[PDB]
């Protein structure tokens, strides 16, 4: 048939549940392609992956692949405009992102249904032909520069960066895959390097139609995609470049057996121990891998874990094989270590040769790889509905390693047991190839070397193969034992009929003085799964720094005693999150709601008779201390944030303040604490999916009557149930509040411009103007004018009341980033005025496309639902009303709300900005306004006592 | 489709040499390892030699050690029984087998009889004076 | 290693069992027409494509035995049974002869 097509694979084996149609084919320019049809989708999407990442960079431009992946975005000779691809999505409800592994670089987006095309033809051109513009090249150069120094001071990226350092330094592997501004720009004009022709030639070279993969999904039929696909990309040149494979690894002989210690930047204490394996991507249909590492990695009774736990070495685990690359991989098992499991690392190690020799004598056992194909199955065959943007990207990405017809099966299923490869993967896991890593500070000072891109100190000494063969002759513990058959798996996968009293939105089933239970039964996913949230609400989780941290201690203490039991729970797709809010606590379980009712009490009942063990309690109370000193080491636009937060709320407890009062936290005071709290509470809860109303009712019912047993809780007063408002800024004013990030060498952002209380009229009127000015302040603030890596704009919310943020992480001082956007701000007000008025109704669909976007997942539904509870506005309804409302705003509409409340010389202009200084700070572009003089915040609590406090906003619904 | 050829049976005696040669069409001797089985006139199967040509390690039976000789060569698809000392005994026909599963790990501790789903039609030796 | 009965008689319909004896823990099972080359039937309880399902597999102990539930006329023939082991070994059994009984 078509000369442009070399074959057409058979049917794509998905899921009974899926209702998208799938079809799969290859270009005869060799892109392997996935097309997908979904004619209920709202937002079309489409993603492109190459196979050629960052271990694919000329040894002198660091990361050049990470740097062209920025450049594509920039321009191409067919839409030659610098950011006409970023303002085509932005102006028809889409975005778009993109990432370079060691292998990959993945481009991705979604866009409104009705205009898949004329995006999909400009996503096209990045791979024709692009223009890499070197005033582009000059500018975009700092955003990566910017990216990699948030980078710097994180633990994460300083470890992962020196694994590849105390490897063979010639292997790819021990590449550096950002680059900065020294590998991009100031290395090539020092040895002349033309970076321009160095990106043509890198394009050429690698992006070859040979290594793409390319998986579009739209509401067009499959007959439809298909032509537009051969009809954009069959032009796509091919050069048959061969798959970059790395079969020799990086961890050989001089690299085994070596101990490593390492000094972080945050107090953490960490063991890696790490085994090389070879590339058992392969034999991913067995998984000899998974099936070892789920073993090791076990948390229930028996496991390597629940022993090193139990007598306090180490509280998380977490072992499996790790990808490396093409030819080699790697096999590791990662723990959290305490204070007296750091002085014990070599006996840890020696539990955990002792767990690997107790699989080695009772061998691979089938009935433990049954049930992992039997749960896969069940996982797949119920499988929510992923998102159109995120779906397509993941496609792309596994497109290559495995033939269309098994895509979407290829990483769920398991077909044949083979535990002759089993053996194999365990026959490497011995003491003569292991690699030890301790992540402490208790190393500062006791190190010779420093990797080079990150600073990290670190030192590698040779581990004693005096200690080696204890390993090796590690005998057989007799608490290590195989994990028991799993009760959790779920059996009855039954879709109770939809109730002849159903509702569309959350109905309130019960409203007594304890509970307010709201229920909906499921009408549009029909899986076999239900969502249960519940809040707690109690004064005293939050009425001082001792009772929060408390209540804090309680929460993780709790769910630590479940974690053995919980954890084949979760294995069998039942999962539970309960953590402490500012009101109280918050219970919520998700997944099947076959066993559903027996985890429930087993949280509930274990949680009004909590036996504190309090060896734990010291172990998580230590952890606590060392997790708020740890906020010091976070980055400073999270820390203007978590300021921000702290100012505009009524009450709020800070870092500090916690931490001073939790030397006062005793053990005695805790147990005299926990029926404190559960004597009086308040319970709202949100039940939503395959359950009928006696059912809701039942599990609340059974709640209750637990509670008023073991706890004898008591209801609380309407007049005790009082949330927290908003500080009320006043007219035309503004207020600074400045700190400094004692660890990163950034600065950080955040510009509140407090509007008016939550109501239709003034959210869309703030949603559209966040619409409006969305495309363009990241163009303007870092396309243009590169501030920082991180640009954010957008609507705020909190209590009830809303504004208009920006946010920016820069190494340029807080009170420059200050005038660059109250510059971008006059710019775009002359932009707004001289916009057509079809450009103006644009944006308006845009907008209203985006947030009539229907939920795809069960929990996604759940979510809003439980938004509009916890915010107590109860507005079900709101999406439909709000987008009613909003088509009918013109252009001065805008305006008017524009020279009210957030022009320079507004009336009614509330500002509050904080200003996180770097850890070394003191004290063409169009022209900053003159700025009113700022008040400067020196001490919160008066800061609130001085103004007034907000309105609570007025539930929908009259109880 | 995937198919065995086996070839060089013929007429031979002791002291003399023989190579039988199996042609592997429809999959690569990388991945399977190759088996050979012989039958004695009336009497039932005896396994010969096995050779895994992916973890590089082969296979005799006690009662032919020394005088046979396995090899696999990759990119001709092509397993051989090199055959230098002949007795009477082993006037037989041999047949050319694979695993039915991928890259069987050889150095398995435990024994794992998955089948052989393809054999060749063997070729007939015979051993005169 | 050691397979009985050596030889079996029985009419086609008839339910025929032959036990194969044991170290390694399993077997498999193959059927050789007289001349032509073996037929793969069952590997590790599970049996392979193409085969009938009157075709069993069982494992009692130390003892394997393969089944045939309804026997059939084109199902006459030799079966072997055949145990892979460590070191890379494998080990057939004598055999056994299905015959028409008359």
């Known amino acids: 048939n078509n000369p442009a097509i070399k074959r057409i694979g058979n049917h794509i084996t998905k899921s009974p549940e899926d209702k998208r149609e799938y079809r799969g084919l290859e270009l005869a320019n060799g892109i392997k392609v996935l097309l997908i049809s979904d004619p209920t989708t709202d937002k079309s999407s489409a993603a492109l992956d190459v196979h050629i990442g960052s271990l694919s960079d000329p040894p002198n431009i660091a990361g050049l692949s990470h740097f062209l992946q920025h450049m594509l975005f920039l321009g191409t000779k067919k839409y030659p405009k610098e950011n006409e691809y970023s303002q085509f999505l932005s102006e028809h409800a889409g975005s778009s992102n993109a990432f370079t592994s060691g292998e990959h670089t993945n481009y991705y987006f979604d866009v409104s249904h009705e205009h898949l095309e004329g995006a999909l033809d400009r996503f096209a051109q990045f791979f024709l032909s692009p223009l890499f513009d070197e005033s582009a090249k000059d500018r975009e150069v700092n955003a990566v520069d910017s990216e990699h120094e948030k980078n710097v001071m994180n633990d994460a990226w300083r470890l992962f960066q020196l694994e590849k350092a105390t490897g063979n330094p010639k292997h790819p592997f021990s590449k550096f895959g950002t680059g900065n501004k020294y590998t991009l720009e100031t290395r090539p004009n020092q040895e002349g390097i033309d970076v321009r022709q160095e990106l043509l030639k890198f394009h050429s070279a690698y992006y070859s139609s040979n290594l793409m993969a390319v998986v579009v999904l739209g509401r067009e039929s499959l007959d439809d995609l298909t032509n537009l696909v051969v009809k954009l990309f069959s032009e796509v040149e091919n050069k048959n470049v061969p798959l970059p494979e790395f079969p020799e690894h990086p961890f050989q002989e001089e690299h085994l057996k070596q101990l490593y210690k390492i000094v972080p930047i945050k107090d953490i204490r960490n063991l890696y121990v790490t085994f090389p394996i070879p590339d058992l991507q392969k034999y991913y249909k067995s998984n000899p891998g998974h099936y070892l590492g789920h073993l090791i990695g076990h948390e229930g009774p028996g496991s390597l874990l629940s022993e090193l736990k139990s007598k306090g070495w180490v509280n998380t685990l977490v072992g499996g094989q790790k990808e490396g690359a093409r030819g080699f991989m790697f096999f590791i098992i990662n723990v959290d270590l305490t204070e007296e499991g750091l002085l014990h690392v070599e006996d840890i190690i020696l539990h955990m040769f002792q767990y690997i020799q107790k699989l080695r004598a009772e061998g691979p056992q089938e009935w433990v790889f049954q049930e992992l194909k039997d749960l896969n199955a069940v996982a797949f065959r119920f499988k929510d509905k992923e998102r159109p943007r995120g779906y397509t990207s993941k496609i792309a990405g596994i497109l290559h390693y495995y033939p269309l017809e098994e895509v979407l099966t290829a990483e769920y299923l398991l077909e044949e047991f083979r535990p002759d490869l089993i053996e194999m993967v365990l026959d490497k896991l011995r003491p003569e190839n292991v690699r030890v890593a301790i992540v402490s500070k208790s190393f500062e000072g006791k190190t010779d070397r420093t990797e080079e891109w990150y600073g990290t100190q670190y030192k590698q000494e040779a581990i004693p193969d005096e200690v080696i063969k204890k390993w090796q002759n590690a005998d057989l513990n007799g608490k290590f034992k195989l994990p028991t058959k799993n009760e959790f798996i779920p059996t009855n996968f039954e879709i109770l009929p939809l109730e002849k009293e159903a509702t569309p939105y959350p109905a309130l089933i019960k409203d007594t003085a304890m509970s307010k239970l709201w229920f909906k039964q499921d009408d549009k996913f029909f899986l076999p799964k239900a969502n249960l949230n519940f809040e707690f609400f109690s004064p005293f989780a939050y009425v001082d720094p001792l009772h929060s941290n408390m209540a804090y201690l309680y929460l993780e203490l709790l769910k630590d005693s479940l974690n053995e039991y919980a954890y084949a729970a979760e294995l069998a797709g039942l999962s539970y999150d309960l953590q402490n809010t500012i009101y109280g606590m918050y219970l919520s379980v998700k997944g099947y709601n076959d066993k559903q009712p027996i985890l429930l009490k087993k949280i509930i009942e274990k949680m009004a008779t909590f036996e504190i063990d309090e060896k734990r309690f010291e172990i998580i109370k230590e952890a606590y201390m060392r997790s708020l000193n740890n906020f010091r080491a976070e980055q400073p636009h999270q820390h203007a944030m978590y300021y921000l937060r702290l100012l505009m709320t009524e009450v709020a407890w800070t870092k500090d303040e916690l931490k001073e009062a939790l030397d006062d936290v005793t053990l005695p005071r805790l147990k005299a604490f926990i029926p404190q709290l559960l004597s009086r509470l308040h319970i709202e809860a949100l039940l939503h999916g395959n359950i009928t109303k006696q059912a809701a009712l039942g599990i609340m019912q059974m709640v209750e009557d637990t509670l008023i047993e073991h706890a004898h809780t008591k209801p609380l007063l309407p007049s005790q149930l009082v949330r927290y408002r908003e500080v009320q800024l006043p007219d035309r004013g503004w207020f600074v509040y400045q700190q400094r990030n004692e660890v990163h060498n950034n600065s950080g952002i955040e510009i509140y411009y407090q509007t008016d209380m939550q109501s239709t009229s003034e959210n869309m009127f703030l949603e559209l103007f966040a619409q409006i000015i969305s495309e363009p302040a990241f163009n303007t603030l870092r396309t243009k004018e590169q501030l920082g890596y991180i640009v954010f704009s957008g609507p705020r919310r909190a209590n009830g009341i809303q504004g208009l943020r920006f946010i920016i992480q820069s190494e340029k001082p807080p009170h420059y980033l200050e005038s660059r956007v109250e510059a971008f701000l006059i710019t775009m007000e002359k932009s707004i005025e001289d916009m057509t008025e079809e450009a103006f109704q644009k944006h308006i669909q845009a907008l209203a496309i985006r947030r009539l976007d229907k939920p795809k997942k069960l929990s996604a539904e759940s979510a809003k639902y439980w938004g509009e509870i916890i915010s107590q506005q109860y507005n079900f309804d709101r999406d439909n009303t709000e987008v009613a409302y909003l088509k009918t705003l013109t252009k001065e509409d805008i305006i008017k709300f524009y020279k009210e409340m957030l022009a320079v010389d507004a009336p009614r202009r509330h500002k509050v900005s904080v200003h996180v200084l770097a850890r070394e700070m003191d004290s063409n572009l169009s022209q900053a306004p003159a700025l009113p003089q700022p008040e400067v915040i020196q001490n919160m609590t008066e800061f609130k006592r001085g103004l007034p406090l907000f309105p609570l906003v007025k539930p929908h619904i009259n109880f | 489709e995937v198919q065995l050829v086996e070839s060089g049976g013929g007429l031979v005696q002791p002291g003399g040499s023989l190579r039988l040669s199996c042609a592997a069409s429809?999959?690569?001797?990388?991945?399977?390892?190759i088996h050979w089985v012989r039958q004695a006139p009336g009497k039932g199967l005896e396994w010969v030699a096995s050779?895994?040509?992916?973890?590089?390690?082969?296979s005799y039976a006690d009662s032919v050690k020394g005088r046979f000789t396995i090899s696999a060569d990759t990119s001709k698809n092509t397993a051989y029984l090199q055959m230098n000392s002949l007795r009477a005994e082993d006037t037989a026909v041999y047949y050319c087998?694979?695993?039915?599963?991928?890259?069987?790990?050889?150095?398995?501790?435990?024994?794992?009889?998955?089948?052989?789903?393809?054999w060749g039609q063997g070729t007939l030796v015979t051993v005169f004076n | 290693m050691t397979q009985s009965p050596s030889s079996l008689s029985a009419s086609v319909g008839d339910r025929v069992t032959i036990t194969c004896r044991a170290?390694?823990?399993?077997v498999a099972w193959y059927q050789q027409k007289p001349g032509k080359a073996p037929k793969l039937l069952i590997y590790?309880?599970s049996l392979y494509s193409g085969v009938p399902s009157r075709f069993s597999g069982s494992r009692s102990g130390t003892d394997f035995t393969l089944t045939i539930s309804s026997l059939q006329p084109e199902d006459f023939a030799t079966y072997y049974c055949?145990?892979?082991?460590?070191?890379?070994?494998?080990?057939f059994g004598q055999g056994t002869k299905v015959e028409i009984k008359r």
């Open positions: 170290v390694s823990s399993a």
């Open positions: 055949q145990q892979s082991s460590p070191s890379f070994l494998i080990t």
């Open positions: 590790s309880s």
């Open positions: 050779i895994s040509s992916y973890y590089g390690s082969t």
């Open positions: 429809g999959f690569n001797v990388s991945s399977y390892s």
């Open positions: 087998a694979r695993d039915r599963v991928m890259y069987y790990w050889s150095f398995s501790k435990y024994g794992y009889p998955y089948g052989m789903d393809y």
